[PDB]
Amino acid sequence: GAFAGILNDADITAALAACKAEGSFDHKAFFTKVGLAAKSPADIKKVFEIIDQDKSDFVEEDELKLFLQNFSAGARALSDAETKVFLKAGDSDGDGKIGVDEFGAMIKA
Ligand SMILES: [Cl-]
Ligand SMILES: [La+3]
Ligand SMILES: [La+3]
Ligand SMILES: [La+3]
Ligand SMILES: [La+3]
């Protein structure tokens, strides 16, 4: 997968299975189960760059909605409500988008 050399396949499978059900996504539980919580800035930056599909330098709402699909193309979209909670949690400064430092801070909360 896209995170070979950074994350563990079994962990990714597990993190996806934990949020298969509609409404069940929880970034804290996802980040801990997927193994991201203890990764270095360099690794977090690489992950961030994958999620930032359009290289805008920020993860915007549209990219957050498709967050899971970076891990598996077959994964579901997040609901609008899931996406909003995720954005609110990540976007420390409230400017509407998530930068790499905000992304790392949410992970290491
Ligand atoms: Cl969340
Ligand atoms: La972007
Ligand atoms: La730029
Ligand atoms: La922000
Ligand atoms: La800002």
Curated annotation (Swiss-Prot):
Residues 39-74, 78-109 form the EF-hand domain. Keywords: Acetylation, Allergen, Calcium, Metal-binding, Muscle protein, Repeat. Ca(2+) 2 binds at D91, D93, D95, K97, E102. Gene3D superfamilies: EF-hand. GO terms for cellular component: cytoplasm. Ca(2+) 1 binds at D52, D54, S56, F58, E60, E63. Thermostable between pH 4.0-9.5. Average melting temperature (Tm) across all pH values is 60 degrees Celsius. Lower melting temperature in acidic pH 4.0-5.0. One of its GO terms (molecular function) is calcium ion binding. The modification N-acetylalanine is found at A2. InterPro entries: EF-hand-dom_pair, EF_Hand_1_Ca_BS, EF_hand_dom, Parvalbumin. Signal peptide: none annotated. Monomer. In muscle, parvalbumin is thought to be involved in relaxation after contraction. It binds two calcium ions. Belongs to the parvalbumin family. This is Parvalbumin beta 2. The gene is pvalb2.
